[PDB]
Design a protein around this nucleic acid. Sequence first.
DNA 1: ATCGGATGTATATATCTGACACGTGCCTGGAGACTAGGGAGTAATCCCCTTGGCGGTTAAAACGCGGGGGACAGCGCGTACGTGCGTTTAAGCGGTGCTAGAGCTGTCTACGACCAATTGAGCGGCCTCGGCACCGGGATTCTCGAT
DNA 2: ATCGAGAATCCCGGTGCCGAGGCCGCTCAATTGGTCGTAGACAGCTCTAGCACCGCTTAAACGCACGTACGCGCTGTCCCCCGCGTTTTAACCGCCAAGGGGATTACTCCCTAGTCTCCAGGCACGTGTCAGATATATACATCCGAT
Lengths: 308, 91, 93, 82, 82, 106, 110, 97, 97
Amino acid sequence: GHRTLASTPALWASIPCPRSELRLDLVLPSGQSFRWREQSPAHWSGVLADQVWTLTQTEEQLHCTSQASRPTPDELEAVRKYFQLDVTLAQLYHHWGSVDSHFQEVAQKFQGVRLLRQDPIECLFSFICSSNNNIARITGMVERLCQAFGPRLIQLDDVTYHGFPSLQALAGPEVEAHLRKLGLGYRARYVSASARAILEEQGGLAWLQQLRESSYEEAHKALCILPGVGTQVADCICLMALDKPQAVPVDVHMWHIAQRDYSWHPTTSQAKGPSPQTNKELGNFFRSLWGPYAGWAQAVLFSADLRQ
Amino acid sequence: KESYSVYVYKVLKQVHPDTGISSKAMGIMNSFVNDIFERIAGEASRLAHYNKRSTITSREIQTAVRLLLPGELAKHAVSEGTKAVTKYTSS
Amino acid sequence: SRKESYSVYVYKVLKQVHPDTGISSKAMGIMNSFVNDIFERIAGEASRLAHYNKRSTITSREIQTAVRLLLPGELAKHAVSEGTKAVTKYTSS
Amino acid sequence: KVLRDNIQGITKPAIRRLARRGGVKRISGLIYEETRGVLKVFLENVIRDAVTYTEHAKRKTVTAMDVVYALKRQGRTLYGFG
Amino acid sequence: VLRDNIQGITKPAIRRLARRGGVKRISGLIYEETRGVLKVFLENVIRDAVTYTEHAKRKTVTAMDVVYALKRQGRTLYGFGG
Amino acid sequence: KAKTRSSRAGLQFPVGRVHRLLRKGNYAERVGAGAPVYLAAVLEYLTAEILELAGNAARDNKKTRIIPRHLQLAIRNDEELNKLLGKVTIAQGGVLPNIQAVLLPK
Amino acid sequence: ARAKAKTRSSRAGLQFPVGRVHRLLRKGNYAERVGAGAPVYLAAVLEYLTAEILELAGNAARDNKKTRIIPRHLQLAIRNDEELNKLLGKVTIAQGGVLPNIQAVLLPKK
Amino acid sequence: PHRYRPGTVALREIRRYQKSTELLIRKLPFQRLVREIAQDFKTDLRFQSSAVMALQEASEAYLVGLFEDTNLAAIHAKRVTIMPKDIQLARRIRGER
Amino acid sequence: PHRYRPGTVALREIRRYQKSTELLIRKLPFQRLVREIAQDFKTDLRFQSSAVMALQEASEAYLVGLFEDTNLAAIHAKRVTIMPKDIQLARRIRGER
DNA sequence: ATCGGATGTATATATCTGACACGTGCCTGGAGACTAGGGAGTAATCCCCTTGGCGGTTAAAACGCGGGGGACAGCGCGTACGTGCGTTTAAGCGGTGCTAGAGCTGTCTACGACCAATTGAGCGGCCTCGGCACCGGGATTCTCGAT
DNA sequence: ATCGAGAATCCCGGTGCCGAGGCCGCTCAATTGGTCGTAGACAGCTCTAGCACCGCTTAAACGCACGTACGCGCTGTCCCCCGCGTTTTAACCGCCAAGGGGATTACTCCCTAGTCTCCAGGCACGTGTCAGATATATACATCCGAT
């Protein structure tokens, strides 16, 4: 079964990390990644760097674990990179708090909300399933998508973990029909269609991976081409999988936050409600308010707004 | 503009092989066919709604024929309809 | 079976019109069938305009046109005013 | 189960009372026969449609909904029942 | 277009229409009554026709709209499109 | 917390139910957002008119209930309602009291 | 390969278009689905009514010594038949005129 | 032996039957008539009581309207008593024929 | 000095106007009247000639039917002339108020 | 009863002509093959709603029997409506021009889409005390016999 | 035009009785969630059909004179419908029983929407061409004013 810090002590390794720098309960189930489950209280399990892990935290430490031994230093580095631990969240909160008193009020109660370094492919298809949907359902869809087309890893209790599907697999024959039976709705077409476009028209995996060196403007532009990947989805990918920290996804949540917490309204736009023009404006508004890491500040308020 | 002009002209040759028809009368027959089509289709839709059925089949087309067309005309019309459907199914 | 109707809604209107007036079951049935008839007439004509203008959908202006066609006299004017007020209030949420 | 001579069931006092509700002051003797005829005609017209509606639904009884639909088809639109 | 156009239907036109209708003798008081009836019918049709045109976001009244408005009142007309 | 559309539009007839029947009734494959609200408002106005007239008629007859006689009388005395309902009978409604002039005694 | 295209109107021996009727029915949003036999049934009914109307109109035209059908002949055909009159009592035919009839007492002293 | 004016009782009857809203036709004979009409179209046919009541109400309304129209026809003829001429005129003008 | 008796050429031209199928109302007066009626509901409406023709034919058929029913009302009261009373009677039974 | 004058149609013939009928070009709506799934046909059930019977009471239908009053036939009159005609006018008919809107195209802001949680009103079950039919009585107003 | 007996009608209070409405249980029905793809709203643009205007011509309106037959008033005649009293009767209400069919529910299957790939049936377009309009000339059908 799933390990716990108390049951198999000699299988866990720690990483210096204070709760103020990271709160797993505020990051893993908040719609950034849809692959983590709190199988046991305060213990989150999921696939990280092609293998299963269980993570749990004390006050100043982040504890990590057919493994038959404690995580190695090399493996632990995989975890630090996933949580981008070289970035000091305390410095970011300070800055955002200094230029936005509302953020300061919220930030006092929701510390440790950071951003996850992610894999481009997993991020692209997970968010293609994020559109017009709720986190609870999205989570299920992504799980069934991985069980059906992803590599089988290991089994803990009655849970069999799977790696994320490859481009070749998602581009396979009759994938759409299969995903519709798995309840993906119309997004089933989007997944099939986008895998093929990338493989048969954009120059495969290399095309998506190269975007990480490209500019936010370029990257976002490149992604909008893919079926199911309009402005909100593209920004999600840029921010969470392509290292574009200034990218700010604009969904219904950030729509409401802007309105009630900043009394914001479109000025350059023509429509009075969400539209491709107003959404783009809201994004710049947040960028001019928080700066270069505006997307990360967005992640904090989004996570906090989920707790309502 | 989709019409029934050539079809009515074809039927006229069957009925009176050596009789002409004016364009005004052609338009009137066109409008008449459209009106009777609208009546039968709408009333068969009412039957479909009333029986909680979502398919317009020949049974309620026949019921609509019996409801709208008068007495002796209805017998001949239903006979023609049954003959046509039987010929279609057999062939 | 679950037979739906407008009985409770007619009762709510009655309480804000004549607060101290009762109503019989036969009258309630008549009122429900009246609501169904007016609804079916207006919806039929609204859909009928959609075909006449080759429009594939029903918007709030086809309903207004149907009301102007059906309701005679000052009922048309007041119903148009009520509908415009209601849609304006709904949009200005 | 044959029913014969039931048009006489529409009694003369009933026709008198109907005419009174219609605001008629004096009634001739032929009016009873004439109104029996027109009632028979109207009931045949209604029952033809009602029985067709019943036959369509594969039902062996005439429900009130069928009568309401038959009346609305002819342009009567009786409220209340159903 | 402005005023006094109801006199456009002169006495002989009404006389000719009544002759077509099977009328032999016409009292003097008929022309004014039938002018009023024609006005009522024409406005009751024109209101619906103009409503159709206005909903069509047009400024020209088509024959098609007049036909449809006539169909609304139960006076179906044939010969001007469907 | 959910805020229902009828209360949002200040209406009592259920906007959601009118919308459901409009879609299911097969009038068009797409139904706009404001059209069911407009329809519900029109139904509100008609129901309010007929119930206020029926209540006036009921109080005229010292009656605290509404009976089909009241509804028929209210419909027939009013002009525009009569024109709207010119081709309808009301079950158990009776007839409006009307006696022609020449039938009265001299 | 494909076995050549033959119209369903020829299949059922009709002149009126089965496929056109089917298209009008499905895009006329009369029901969610349309059965196979319904377009053929309705096309046959329309053909029979048109045949009846045209036959009566042709008889009227022949009795008037004209070889071309005009709406006056259609008017005579519709209102000289009792049942057809009942079916189309609430329709007006443009340029149709009125059937000739005069009341009895209007006729002069015998 | 006091006796009324022959017309006054009639007008009393008018007021009495325009005041109330009862059926004015015996239910069972009307039901028998309806079943007799219905047997010729389809033998062994059952009837719901509500359907019979609906038929009776609709027939009463239709006859009341017809009698009102034929009363107008009789009055137009400078008469008081109705004639079958009046009924046939009412049906012809209405369009039933 | 030859004259036809009253009701002879009056009885004639009935056959002529039932024989013909023309309009019997001048086009231009009806055009002006239709525009006059139109200007009340909206200012400066354009009218196709087909629309005016359709209105003319509809109104003319309506008036022909009304005059037939008026003749029926007149012949009912043992009259050969028609009076407006006939017109209100025919409208009243027809339900036109 | 009848007879020709005179209108008013019926009938027959020459001579255009513009709607009618035909062939042709072309494309777009119809057709053939194939697939997936849900509307619908079919079997079992229960319960309930319809039919039928039986009997007692009596409101109501049947029927006779005046008698008055309203339908109705006949006669007179005077006036309102027809027929005919000279005069006016305006309705078609035919151009000619003006142009504002009708209709077809090319771009981008409001609904459909999948459906699962999420309440939360909306209907079913079930009291319950009051609105109102009914009775019992007495007083008021209409109605027709009398002067 | 009143008086007044007498009959239909209106007003007041008591009685009880069932149903309109309130309350609770339970349950499906709008509502919404990290949006995006997509049809309708809008601007653009052509061109045509509707508007105005004027001149010519002649068919229709019409103002008027005149005669006559129709509507209307008035009358007496008579028959037939209504009020009323008496005599059946079968309508109605209450109760009871039996079972036919009409909602239901579960199950399967096959008919049809959707889609891809064609192709010829039918819609513009052009052109001969004769049924019918139309003018002309004769045949006779029928009112009708005497006769």
